[model samples]
Target: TICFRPINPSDLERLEQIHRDIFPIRYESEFFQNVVNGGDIVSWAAVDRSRPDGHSEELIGFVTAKIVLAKESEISDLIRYDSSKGEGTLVYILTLGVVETYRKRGIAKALINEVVKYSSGIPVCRGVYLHVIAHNNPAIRLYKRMSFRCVRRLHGFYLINGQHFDSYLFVYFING
Candidate 1:
């Protein structure tokens, strides 16, 4: 069975390898360092606890996110928060992925649900949001099915492998 837990230093190597295999873009080493350290970035790892031998807690899926003040984010105008008030924040999903063999098993949804649950617990958190490459239909559909609103489409939002791709901004309000 798969169980979710907070990412720790032990997941560093596997996290780097999985990101390299699953994502088209490359991430800085500092990002991985921060993920494991939980410095500024909050993350979760999905591990198959049922595995036998030494691989019982290996990471199969993961989600990394950051909390930012809504007034300072790009989606400030998009969210319905009173910026002039106190520190209203929003959770930004930086990356989310499950290994190829682990796809279609609802692990991704469960990971996202964790983010939503975390955001909802913070009194200042107004919403959770993410960006999906326009061509990634599976992810788009997933977010839609999870009831996230596609608030905008950014032209040439991503530059990968010398090519620019559009991106769809998706947002899920906590209480709006």
Candidate 2:
């Protein structure tokens, strides 16, 4: 059975390995440290309880996000928040991925839903947002399927492996 839980310190190495294997971007070690610490970044881990031979609870998928003040965010103008009040916040999805063997099993969707649920509960939260590389059609489709709107196309938003790539900024508005 597949289960979802908050990411813990035990997941530090596995999380780094998975990200390295799945994404072209290399994250700083401090980022992983913050994720496992759960200080600034909130995260969820997907595990298969059904796995036998002591493999149960192994990290299979994960989503990491951070809550940023809307006023300080680049998409501040795009989101519908009262700037005068200045208390609005947004959940920024940093990274999300599932192991190759576990794809097409709704793991990514479920992990995103966890972020949405977490964002929705905060009264000051205006939305959940993320940037997807333009060429990642599968990820773009998945985000669209989850009801996130593609609000903008940012040219050269990502510089990976010495190549600049455009990005689609997707948002799921919650409060407004």
| Number of backbone-clashing residue pairs for each candidate, in the order shown | 0, 0
TM of each candidate vs. truth: 0.95, 0.95
Instruction: Name the lDDT of candidate 1.
Output: 0.91
Clashing pairs in 1: none
* Candidate 1 off by > 4 Å: 83-85
TM-score of 2: 0.95
Candidate 2 per-residue C-alpha lDDT over 58-140 given as tens digits, one digit per residue, 9 for 90 to 100: 88999999989888988888866565766688899999999999999999999999999999998888889999999999999
Clashing pairs in 2: none
Model 1, range 1-176, lDDT digits (tens) per residue? 89999999999999999999898667999999999999678999999988778887889999999989888988888766565667698999999999998899999999999999999998888989989999999999999999999988999999898999999999998876
Q: Where's the lowest-lDDT run of ten residues in candidate 2? A: 78-87
Q: What lDDT does candidate 2 reach at residue 104?
A: 98
